[PDB]
Q: What sequence folds into this?
């Protein structure tokens, strides 16, 4: 009103902001889907700023009128709606609903409540996971992950009312004061109970639609939504959000969520033949089983698992993975599906899966697009190798000792198609064989949020401030070859990590690189890295320096391979260039500093002094 | 966030600066609501604690709350207010006590009113504990009088008795013989006061007023209108017992007088109510009056209770023609009042929505009231009904931003609203559908039936029959009639579109037909389509449904009133036409009427009302009115789930086809000639399914749908030649058609058996049909086996040849014994239609073929049904439980069972009454009563002890019913002396949850002793029991139990009449309770005793408990001068 | 031989494109017989489920789309037979989640078609197959079974099911409860109080769990405070005999209750003013 009074005295214009909203409310009801799409885009630009203003009744009314568009015949109106509803903060909308007295009644004098969050979440976002268009299902799944942080429910232990809920968000930003595989978390997570409550309600609603689904589209959309949720809110961190009671404890907490639904889908006659929904189910099944870890691990088959109720689920997933990887190996080698744990010829549902995969790869063999990430045979193979790599953290030499010769056979077929994930799978087999895997190495209110907790943390901080091994050789030899003939820096990182792991397992480097060709080639990359000609060098530098630093300890091969004086002259050779310090020089120093100061003399003191002269 | 946070911080500051009274004063005086709202924030709790530690601050805090008590009255704000006031300073106790008594104690939230009471008690107890010179300075006498005079004048003193006694203790520290005119005075003390407590007892009291006085008693301004529906229901129980009810005719005249008197207050011209002038001012003055608005639902509740019975009354009790217009005006004004209340003053009471919609539903069903509202004079009334029903539906069912589906202009709006509502019956008004989940289940049946009736009005009917897709296809005829809305019937060129035709079929099936003209028009339209295979199939399904709709009973073609005719295969039971059978029909009829209330599907009952069940079975003779539900006791087919009214195979029995049409080995219904329809279809279908050699082969789908159509429309056949041509056609079809078609066989097999059974099952028909049945029982496809069992049930109605029975009955008996034994322990995992039709076939064989079916069969079937009935709620579904148990009751009551079979049913019936579930126990009680009366000792004393246990262990519903039947069971199986000790013991026992039910059992037992001349025996048992009555532990329950006992013992008609008054005052010990107790005990002493040794005995028992001022000491004081 | 199974598959797809649902379903049953002879149990359970869906579609067209009075229900019998066979297959394949899903599909069709008493038995069968491996899915199945028993007017059967749900939700969801189980607990608590006020059991039928609930209302926890004050007020008004309190509470409670709970509160007020079992 103060801004509008200023422009009205300067211009003489009688116009008012309340005169616009009727024109959006009109154009949302247009006969043309393109007008309707553009009107939905216009609501996306302003709805949250309206809810944040003295016109917040009009912002609430736009959210009511836009929900009509869920029934539109045009998919772009459905995706614009999903993207619009994902902008909304339901803590703020719950505050606006609680002050409404006329808007609950609307036209026709309704006698209940608006219930906008329940209508958005259930009647739009979870409903459009059942859409026949996979583009709509994908945007519905992505919109749901944006909503979980912003939902509000009554009787929450962290926020009793929506005004306390909005004050938490506003305060949390401005008053802010071997390596295990991707799905494992052994430390006790400290979690927001309000987020874990919201996540519990969302997962319960999506798993209800999954188990009750009568259409292939809705089953597939629910799997996509649960797979992306398990990525954004990891099952091992958020275990009480994922928990359905299945392991009868905390019913530092652990879970398998709804893994029995997902493994029943993976053994069905129909569900495995959609490659996208199948690969989402593999990733979700891997994540659900890995989130059991420190509670399911001990203190015979799968002897590491003391929780014998999960052993059938692990054997089922592991045997499914070996069969589907063996199918890919047959398709890539062009071998017909006919004449041990990966055997599939006697199983008609796996013969149908083979013919889908063969047809998918036949289209790949006759086309030349090399930027497309959405290619379904490669995505499927990559997902199966990733989940096998994840399940190998729970394995022991007694579990893989009959399988390892078989799996390395499949990896030799798969290496040309997915070399990076085949290399990860080799590393997890080596961890399992040498015994270095996980299985072997084992009342709040406004005063609280707006002042008292921030001031308590600040004052306490000021107070403290005053105080089988021969089977692996041809795959390591393929990896060493391909590093010298590739421009994929993501593969090159992974081969340096494999070589670092072989050096840490005390494998002799003179067996891997007798003629010094690999160190010679790795050193010859620094010419191109320094002059700015090696593309994506920012990805490879820290792995090269970690590897050369391990090679500095191997003095016993009659002579030292490189030595810290050369690594330091490589490091300042990068640092002297015009290339940015944060992507280049700093990532080269981090391996050197932890080695020279944390891990590890008349030479060594001078090297520490030289490195401090570089840090300055 | 800033508004709340800045108060919290300023409270945290003032708690460190308590010398600075200016900031404390400004917080209290300007932010009291925000302090009370935020009282859970730690600094605000500390601030309120500092205000409690200060005399002047506590005074400001109290005076501030007084200035905001029009707010601070939402439940959570009132709770928070009392939580602040609890700790307040000792020197302010008179001021806060005043705030409690003259503002906060008046509140309607019951849990919060006890918090105000408890806190007020604590503050007056502090004022009694403090030194009196301070306490009378806190409470002047000119305030201490106000609070007590207000507590008396507001009626709070009789609810908050402790508080008034503490104010009394504080002020004291500072300063007759019973007759008609007595009886009418007792009843007006209960019936001339506005309340909704004890309405069933209140009706029973008005029923004993002399018939000459009842009209004057119910016409007085003081009479509680809430008694009109109870009186009409109680009086209908007398009419349906064959008596004249003086109470029903009084209540009828008063309901119609009050309905007419309410219409005489409306404006003399009517305008359509629209949710979006002087007339609207008059309506705001009428509907805004709290007296008039309360009168509308209460009179509507009485009107609905009259209208729901009216077609079953004597002809002089039917609607007066002169009051039909006023009833339509009243029913319209009630929905307008409910709609006006929803706009201005939130949702009505659920009982008040229900009463308005009940009247509207019932008035549209009656043909007299229908003839008024469908007239041109009533167009604005018809539009108002439509606007109000649409408005109430959206106000309940549709959230803001949703919509229901996803001429004067009020006429066009009415058309569109009824068409929108007729589509909503698929979804929003479909009971148990996902779209119905926002409608509460008491509204769904009412709204469905109201919408089907409104869609039949001449104003909107032809519009509503047009498919919405045809208006979108740009069709645009000019309408023309008395209302300007008569559209022509849809052109046959539109019905060539599949989805337009599906939309048309839905509307003709949902609405039915309003006259024979509309039937003949829709017949012509569907033959115009019938003359693409999918359109032909839909046309065969539509014409089948049209012809079957003529078979609907009390008014043909009207789905809002009527359901399909049933002609059950089972006969009247001759065992009921006997001395013990007639007494069984009464007691079993009480139990059956309650099983219907509990378990019936209620498909033909739209309105809420128990005790309204009816079956669509006409009185049948060679060519009537419906046979009453009390005359069909065990006649309805065993395979039909209770209260389901949908079509089934076996709908019409072979004996009914033979009797009604005279074709032993009705042609016009609602003026439709079903003979010319069914003859045309039989001829058309006979050409299509047996095509000539030059014609293209008929599609298999069309053959199956035509043979299904024959199976259905053959219920309308009227001549032997029709069943003969049906039989010949289906026989030749079975010869040429490939025998592996199990999709055809499921219709062809029932249809062939039905035609063979009507033709009389002679040797040339019977051998082919037997060979068809034996092979169909071996099918892979379960619906075709269920079809064979319905075919078997059709042929069992015939006088079969011995040589076909010797062949057929063994195969049927083997199939039943092989299939029932494998499933009886786990019925829930098997097809319920297969189990129900098997049990019906077995029960028909045991009753009608007991010499051809072996003696092992009857024993084996009873053993397997016992295994089903002994299964848990999960293992045996309720539908199989009730249908098997009514089949076993028929078996026993038919007298074809052996004495050993009957003894096995006795053992079954007694075990099955001992279950948690009240409806399963109530049915098992029906079987046990059937066993005992057909059985006409220590055994009967066990059986009566089961009934007494069901009263003690039972829910109030089952216990009340068991207590209604128990008096007749006692009189039928015992000399009174054998059970008299149990009857009085079970009334007295401290383990009795229901003394109020047992009071009527004692009353009925003592009244049968007076009527049978045993008046010498009631004095023996009163004098014997009196000691045990004085030992009842609470003196209120002891005095009350003796009041019931002496009322039960009295020969005096007016003392015997007051039992409902005594029952309605259970556990009270007011002066009126002691006064009545003394009078009813005096009546027993003056009239039932005469012997001076018994007068001495009576006084000697009272002396053991006659402590001073007790009701016993009052009674001895009253007796000792007689 | 499998070639007959693909030919029956093609015939089924073509007959479905012609809307010939009973013969399309019959072709899927012929595929199931081919899968049985090949010992491909997963393919047999698939073929039987697709046969059942075509029969359920035929029943929905007859009783929902067209509302034919001549629909006595023969395709529902065919559907339930094929679902029962596929459930029996999934249980011997060791797949109780797939068996439960087909029970829920039949229960949903029976509820939609106006058979809630039959739907409640199939909802309870689904719950029992789920319970040892999917507790929260089993609670979702019991919630539907309770909803069906209220539509069937089996109020004591609903009181038993909500009592089982609240015990299971405390046992698997825990004194605070996780988000999804807490929503189950609030539904059970409010519905059980209204059912205990409707049914009014004698001291022989007050279980420890029922008495323990009615003591709490004679501290709101998972319930919102305004509803908890209104429920405490309703328990007091019905333990008194205050019809004008129950009337005024029913209007304040209407916005806070579900439609199923507003029906229960209507039944409490109706049973208070006009009791059942008197024959008048
Ligand atoms: C959607 N759709 N399309 C085909 C089809 C067949 C069966 C089922 C039943 N459901 C099911 C069948 C087999 C395996 C798993 C499950 C899921 C419950 C679950 F485990 F999540 C659904 C189907």
A:
């Amino acid at each position: 009103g103060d801004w509008m009074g200023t422009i009205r005295t300067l211009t003489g214009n009688t116009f008012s902001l309340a005169d616009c909203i009727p024109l959006l409310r009109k154009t949302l009801k247009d006969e043309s889907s393109v007008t309707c799409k553009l009107a939905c885009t216009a609501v996306r630009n302003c709805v949250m700023s309206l809810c944040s203003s003295s016109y917040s009744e009009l912002g609430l009314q736009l959210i009511i009128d836009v929900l009509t568009l869920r029934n539109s015949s045009y998919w772009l109106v459905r995706t614009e709606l999903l993207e619009t509803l994902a902008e909304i903060d339901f803590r703020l909308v719950s505050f606006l609903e609680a002050k409404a007295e006329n808007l609950h009644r609307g036209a026709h004098h309704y006698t209940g409540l608006l219930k906008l969050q329940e209508r958005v979440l259930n009647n739009v976002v979870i409903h459009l996971l059942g859409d026949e268009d996979p583009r709509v299902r994908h945007v519905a799944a992505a919109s749901l992950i944006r909503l979980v942080p912003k939902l509000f429910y009554k009787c929450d232990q962290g926020q009793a009312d929506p005004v306390v809920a909005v004050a938490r968000d506003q305060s949390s930003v401005y008053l802010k004061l071997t390596r295990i595989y991707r799905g494992y978390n052994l430390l006790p997570s400290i979690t927001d109970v309000t987020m874990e409550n919201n996540l519990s309600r969302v997962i319960a609603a999506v798993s209800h639609e999954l188990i009750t689904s009568t259409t292939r589209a809705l089953t597939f959309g629910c799997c996509e939504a649960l797979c992306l949720l398990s990525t954004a809110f990891p099952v091992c961190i958020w275990s009480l959000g994922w928990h359905c009671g299945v392991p009868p404890l905390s019913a530092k907490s652990c879970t398998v969520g709804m893994a029995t639904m997902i493994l029943t889908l993976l053994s069905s006659a129909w569900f495995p033949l959609d490659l996208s929904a199948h690969q989402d189910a593999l990733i979700l099944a891997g994540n659900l089983l890995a989130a059991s870890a420190p509670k399911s691990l001990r203190s015979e088959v799968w002897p590491a698992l003391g929780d014998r109720a999960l052993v059938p689920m692990v054997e089922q997933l592991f045997s499914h993975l070996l069969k589907v990887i063996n199918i890919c190996a047959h398709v890539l080698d062009d071998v017909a599906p006919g004449p041990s744990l990966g055997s599939f010829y006697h199983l008609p549902s796996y013969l149908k899966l083979h013919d889908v995969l063969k047809a998918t790869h036949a289209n790949y063999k006759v086309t030349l697009d090399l930027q497309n990430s959405t290619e379904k045979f490669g995505g499927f193979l990559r997902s199966a190798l990733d989940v096998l790599s994840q399940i190998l953290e729970l394995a022991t030499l007694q579990d893989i000792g009959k399988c390892v010769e078989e799996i390395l056979g499949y990896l030799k077929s798969c290496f040309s198609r997915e070399p990076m994930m085949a290399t990860v799978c080799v590393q997890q087999l080596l961890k399992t064989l040498f015994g270095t895997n996980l299985a072997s190495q084992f009342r709040p209110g406004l005063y609280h949020y707006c002042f008292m907790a921030p001031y308590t943390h600040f004052t306490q901080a000021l107070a403290d401030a005053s105080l089988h091994i021969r089977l692996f050789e041809p795959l390591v030899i393929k990896a060493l070859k391909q590093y010298t003939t590739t421009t994929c820096v993501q593969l090159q990182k992974q081969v340096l990590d494999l070589l670092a792991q072989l050096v840490q397992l005390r494998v002799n480097y003179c067996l891997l690189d007798s003629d010094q060709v690999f160190i010679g080639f790795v050193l010859k990359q620094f010419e191109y890295i320094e002059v700015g000609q090696f593309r994506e060098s920012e990805a490879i530098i820290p792995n090269i320096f970690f590897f050369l630093v391990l090679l500095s300890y191997e003095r016993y091969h009659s002579k030292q391979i490189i030595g810290i004086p050369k690594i330091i002259q490589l490091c300042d050779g990068i640092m002297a260039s015009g290339r940015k310090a944060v992507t280049h020089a700093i990532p080269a120093l981090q391996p050197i500093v932890h080695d020279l100061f944390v891990l590890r003399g008349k030479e060594l003191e001078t090297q520490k002094e030289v490195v401090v002269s570089m840090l300055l | 966030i800033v508004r709340r946070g800045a108060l919290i911080l300023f409270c945290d500051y003032v708690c460190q600066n308590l010398h600075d009274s200016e900031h404390l004063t400004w917080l209290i005086v300007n932010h009291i609501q925000d302090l009370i709202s935020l009282s859970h924030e730690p600094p605000v709790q500390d601030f309120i604690s500092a205000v409690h530690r200060n005399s002047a601050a506590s005074g400001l805090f109290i005076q501030a709350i007084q200035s905001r008590c029009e707010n601070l009255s939402t439940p959570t704000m009132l709770k928070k207010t009392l939580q602040c006031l609890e700790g307040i300073h000792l020197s302010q106790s008179g001021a806060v006590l005043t705030l409690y008594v003259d503002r906060l104690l008046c509140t309607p939230f019951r849990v919060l009113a006890r918090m105000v009471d408890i806190l007020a008690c604590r503050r007056v107890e502090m004022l009694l504990a403090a030194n009196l010179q301070s306490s009378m300075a806190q409470l002047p006498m000119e305030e201490l009088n106000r609070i007590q005079e207000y507590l008396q004048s507001s009626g709070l003193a009789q609810r908050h008795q402790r508080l008034y006694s503490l104010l009394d203790r504080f002020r004291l520290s500072t300063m007759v013989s019973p007759d008609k005119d007595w009886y009418v005075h007792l009843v007006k003390s209960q019936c001339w006061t506005r309340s909704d407590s004890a309405l069933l007892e209140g009706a029973e009291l008005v029923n004993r007023i002399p018939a000459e006085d009842m009209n004057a008693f119910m016409m007085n301004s003081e009479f509680n209108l809430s008694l009109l529906a109870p009186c009409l229901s109680l009086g209908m129980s007398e009419i349906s017992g064959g008596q004249k009810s003086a109470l029903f005719e009084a209540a009828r005249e008063v309901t119609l007088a009050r309905v007419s008197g309410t219409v005489q207050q409306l404006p003399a011209v009517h305008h359509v109510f629209q949710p979006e002038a002087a007339y609207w001012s008059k309506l705001n003055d009428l509907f805004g009056d709290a007296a008039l608005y309360q009168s509308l639902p209460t009179l509507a509740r009485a009107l609905a209770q009259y209208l729901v019975v009216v077609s079953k009354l004597p002809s002089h009790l039917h609607l007066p023609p002169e009051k039909e217009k006023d009833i339509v005006k009243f029913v319209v004004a009630t929905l307008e009042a409910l709609s006006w209340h929803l706009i201005h003053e939130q949702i009505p009471l659920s009982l008040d929505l229900q009463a308005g919609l009940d009247c509207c539903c019932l008035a549209l069903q009656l043909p007299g009231l229908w003839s008024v509202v469908s007239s041109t004079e009533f167009v604005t009334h018809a539009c108002s009904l439509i606007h109000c029903v649409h408005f109430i539906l959206e106000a309940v069912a549709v959230q803001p931003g949703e919509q229901l589906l996803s001429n004067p202009k009020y006429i066009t709006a009415a058309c569109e609203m009824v068409a929108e509502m007729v589509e909503s019956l698929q979804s929003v008004l479909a009971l148990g559908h996902k779209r119905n989940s926002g409608v509460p289940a008491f509204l769904t049946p009412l709204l469905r039936n109201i919408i089907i009736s409104l869609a039949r009005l001449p104003l909107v009917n032809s519009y509503t029959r047009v498919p919405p897709l045809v208006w979108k296809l740009g069709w645009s005829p000019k309408p023309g009639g008395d209302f300007g809305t008569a559209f022509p019937e849809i052109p046959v060129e539109f019905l060539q579109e599949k989805e337009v035709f599906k939309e048309f079929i839905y509307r003709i099936n949902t609405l039915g037909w309003t006259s024979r003209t509309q039937f003949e028009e829709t017949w012509a339209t569907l033959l115009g389509v019938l003359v693409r295979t999918q359109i032909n199939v839909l046309a065969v399904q539509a014409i089948t449904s049209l012809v079957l709709s003529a078979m609907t009973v009390p008014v043909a073609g009207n789905p809002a009133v009527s359901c399909l005719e049933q002609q059950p295969r089972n006969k009247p039971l001759k065992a009921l036409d006997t001395r013990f059978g007639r007494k069984l029909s009464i007691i079993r009829g009480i139990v059956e009427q309650e099983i219907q209330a509990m378990v019936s599907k209620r498909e033909n009952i739209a309105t809420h009302h128990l005790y309204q069940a009816w079956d669509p079975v006409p009185s049948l003779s060679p060519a009537g009115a419906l046979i009453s539900h009390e005359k069909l006791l065990l006649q309805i087919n065993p395979e039909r789930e209770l209260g389901s009214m949908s079509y089934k195979l076996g709908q019409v029995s072979i004996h009914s086809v033979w009797l009604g049409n005279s074709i032993t080995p009705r042609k016009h219904r609602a003026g439709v000639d079903i003979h010319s329809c069914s003859q045309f279809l039989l001829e058309l279908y006979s050409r299509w399914i047996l095509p000539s050699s030059s014609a293209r082969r008929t599609p298999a789908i069309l053959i199956s749908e035509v043979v299904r159509s024959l199976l259905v429309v053959s219920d309308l056949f009227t001549e032997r030649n029709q069943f003969e041509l049906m039989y010949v056609t289906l026989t030749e079809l079975r010869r040429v058609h490939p025998s592996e078609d199990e999709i055809l066989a499921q219709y062809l097999v029932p249809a062939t058996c039905k035609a063979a059974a009507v033709l009389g099952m002679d040797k040339a028909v019977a051998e082919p049909v037997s060979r068809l049945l034996e092979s169909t029982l071996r099918s892979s496809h379960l619906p075709s086996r269920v079809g064979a069992l319905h075919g078997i049930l059709y042929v069992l109605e015939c006088d079969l040849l011995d040589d076909t029975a010797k062949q057929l009955i063994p195969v049927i008996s083997d199939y039943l014994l092989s299939n029932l034994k494998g499933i009886a322990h786990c019925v829930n995992i098997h097809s319920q239609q297969h189990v129900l039709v098997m049990c019906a076939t077995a029960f028909y064989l045991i009753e009608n073929y007991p010499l051809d079916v072996g003696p092992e069969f009857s024993a084996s079937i009873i053993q397997m049904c016992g295994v089903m009935l002994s299964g848990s709620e999960e293992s045996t579904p309720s539908i199989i439980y009730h249908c098997a148990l009514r089949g076993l009751e028929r078996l026993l009551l038919s007298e074809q069972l052996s004495r050993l079979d009957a003894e096995s049913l006795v053992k079954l019936s007694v075990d099955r009454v001992n279950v948690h579930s009240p409806h399963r126990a109530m049915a098992a009680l029906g079987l046990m009563l059937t066993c005992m009366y057909t059985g006409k000792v220590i055994v009967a004393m066990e059986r009566v002890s089961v009934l007494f246990d069901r009263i003690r262990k039972g829910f109030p519903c089952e216990a009340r019913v068991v207590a209604r039947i128990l008096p007749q069971f006692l009189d039928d199986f015992f000399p009174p002396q054998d059970i008299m000790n149990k009857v009085i013991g079970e009334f007295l026992s401290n383990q009795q949850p229901y003394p109020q039910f047992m009071a009527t059992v004692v009353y009925k037992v003592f009244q049968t002793l007076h009527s049978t001349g045993q008046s010498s025996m009631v004095r023996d048992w009163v004098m014997l029991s009196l000691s045990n009555f004085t030992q009842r532990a609470p003196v209120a329950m002891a005095t009350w139990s003796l009041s019931c006992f002496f009322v039960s013992a009295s020969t005096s008609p007016w003392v015997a009449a007051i039992l409902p008054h005594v029952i309605s005052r259970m556990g009270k010990l007011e002066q009126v309770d002691v006064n009545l107790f003394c009078l009813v005990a005096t009546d027993f002493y003056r009239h039932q005793i005469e012997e001076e040794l018994d007068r001495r005995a009576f006084q000697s028992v009272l002396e053991v408990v006659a402590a001073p001022g007790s009701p016993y000491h009052r009674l001895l004081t009253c007796l000792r001068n007689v | 031989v499998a070639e007959a199974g693909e030919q029956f598959g093609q015939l089924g797809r073509e007959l479905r494109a012609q809307e010939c649902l009973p013969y399309a379903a019959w072709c899927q049953l012929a595929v199931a017989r081919c899968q049985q002879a090949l010992f491909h149990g997963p393919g047999e359970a698939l073929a039987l489920t697709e046969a059942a869906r075509l029969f359920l579609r035929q029943e929905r067209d007859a009783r929902q789309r067209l509302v034919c009075p001549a629909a006595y229900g023969e395709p529902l019998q065919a559907a339930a037979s094929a679902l029962g066979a596929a459930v029996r297959l999934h249980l011997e394949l060791g797949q109780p989640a797939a068996a439960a899903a087909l029970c829920l599909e039949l229960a949903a069709a029976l509820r939609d078609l106006g058979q809630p008493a039959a739907a409640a038995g199939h909802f309870q069968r689904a719950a029992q197959l789920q319970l040892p491996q999917l507790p929260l899915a089993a609670l979702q199945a019991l919630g539907e079974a309770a909803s069906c028993q209220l539509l069937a007017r089996d109020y004591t059967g609903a009181l038993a099911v909500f009592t089982r749900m609240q015990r299971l939700a405390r046992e698997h969801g825990s004194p605070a409860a996780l988000g999804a189980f807490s929503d189950v607990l609030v539904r059970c608590e409010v519905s059980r109080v209204l059912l205990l006020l409707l049914l009014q059991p004698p001291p022989a039928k007050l279980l420890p769990e029922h008495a323990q609930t009615l003591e709490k209302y004679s501290s709101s926890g998972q319930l919102p405070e305004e509803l908890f004050l209104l429920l405490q007020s309703l328990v007091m008004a019905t333990h008194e005999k205050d019809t004008e309190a129950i009337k005024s509470l029913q209007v304040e409670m209407w916005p806070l209750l579900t439609a199923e709970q507003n029906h229960l509160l209507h039944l409490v007020l109706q049973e208070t003013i006009s009791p059942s079992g008197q024959g008048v």
User: Anything to note?
Assistant: The interface with chain A takes residues 38, 40, 42-43, 45-46, 53, 93, 95, 97-98, 100-101, 104-105, 108, 133-137, 140, 171-174, 176, 178-183, 186, 221-224, 254-255 of chain C (CB under 8 Å).
